[PDB]
């Protein structure tokens, strides 16, 4: 099937693991910085994994910033969205680390999880696809909708080199149903809606100024 999806699997960055500080006692600070920590480290994997997306190299640096700064936390979403996707009512954030109900709860992040679980319900039903769900994240960054973007028609040339993946792709693969490509992409809005919640949430954690975060990850929630 088509190329730019299957470079996009071979591309595909390996799991990274939470690893929750053994000795911290259990609470929703602990929490809260372990998964701040396990962004830092997924955003400078993705700010590589970005680089094999055909087109999103030879943009400008600046444009190449004012997407991933508007799209990481989609990214980031997604992610933990399709390691869900066998699981019920859990997010695997990572493999060491799997928040039910409760520990959303604790964590203060019952509503953002409720949103996520709601992103994985939906693409359950449609049985979403590894191949779907790198090209949707590829889709993702460069539909982001940057305020601050200088070739304009360069970046809507690469939604659209993706977007055609996506298209070539569901057409040759998925004769069923000539819409899955559409339906593919009607699924962005709730995910940049989640996404926007997540930033607002955590940037009310940073501005609590009771959770340590990184350098990478501060640039981008301060973005
Ligand atoms: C939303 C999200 C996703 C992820 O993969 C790591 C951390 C956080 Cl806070």
Same mark, same amino acid.
């Given at each position: 099937?088509?190329?730019?999806?299957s470079?996009?699997?071979?591309?595909?960055?390996?799991?990274?693991?939470?690893?929750?500080?053994?000795?911290?006692?259990?609470?929703?600070?602990k929490?809260?910085?372990?998964l701040?920590?396990?962004?830092?480290?997924?955003?400078?994997?993705?700010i590589?994994?970005?680089?094999?997306?055909?087109g999103?190299?030879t943009?400008?640096?600046?444009? @190449?910033?004012?997407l991933?700064?508007?799209?990481?936390?989609?990214?980031?979403?997604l992610?933990v969205?399709?390691?869900?996707?066998?699981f019920?009512?859990?997010?695997?954030?990572?493999?060491?680390?799997?928040?039910?109900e409760?520990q959303?709860?604790?964590?203060?992040?019952?509503?953002?999880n409720?949103?996520?679980? @709601?992103?994985? +319900?939906?693409?359950?039903?449609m049985?979403?696809?590894?191949?779907?769900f790198?090209?949707?994240?590829?889709?993702?960054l460069?539909?982001?909708?940057?305020?601050?973007?200088e070739?304009?028609?360069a970046?809507? +040339?690469? @939604?659209d080199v993706?977007?055609?993946?996506?298209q070539?792709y569901?057409?040759?693969?998925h004769m069923?149903?000539?819409?899955?490509?559409?339906?593919?992409?009607?699924?962005?809005?709730?995910?940049?809606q989640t996404?926007?919640?997540?930033? @607002?949430?955590?940037?009310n954690?940073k501005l !609590?100024?009771?959770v340590?975060?990184?350098?990478?990850?501060? !640039?981008?929630?301060?973005?």
């Amino acid at each position: 099937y088509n190329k730019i999806v299957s470079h996009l699997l071979v591309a595909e960055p390996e799991k990274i693991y939470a690893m929750p500080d053994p000795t911290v006692p259990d609470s929703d600070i602990k929490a809260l910085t372990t998964l701040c920590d396990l962004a830092d480290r997924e955003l400078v994997v993705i700010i590589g994994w970005a680089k094999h997306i055909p087109g999103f190299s030879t943009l400008s640096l600046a444009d @190449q910033m004012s997407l991933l700064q508007s799209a990481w936390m989609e990214i980031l979403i997604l992610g933990v969205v399709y390691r869900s996707l066998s699981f019920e009512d859990e997010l695997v954030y990572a493999d060491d680390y799997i928040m039910d109900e409760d520990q959303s709860k604790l964590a203060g992040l019952l509503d953002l999880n409720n949103a996520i679980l @709601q992103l994985v +319900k939906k693409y359950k039903s449609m049985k979403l696809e590894k191949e779907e769900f790198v090209t949707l994240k590829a889709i993702a960054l460069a539909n982001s909708d940057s305020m601050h973007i200088e070739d304009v028609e360069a970046v809507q +040339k690469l @939604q659209d080199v993706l977007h055609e993946a996506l298209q070539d792709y569901e057409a040759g693969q998925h004769m069923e149903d000539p819409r899955r490509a559409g339906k593919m992409l009607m699924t962005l809005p709730l995910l940049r809606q989640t996404s926007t919640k997540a930033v @607002q949430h955590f940037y009310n954690i940073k501005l !609590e100024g009771k959770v340590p975060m990184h350098k990478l990850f501060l !640039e981008m929630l301060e973005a």
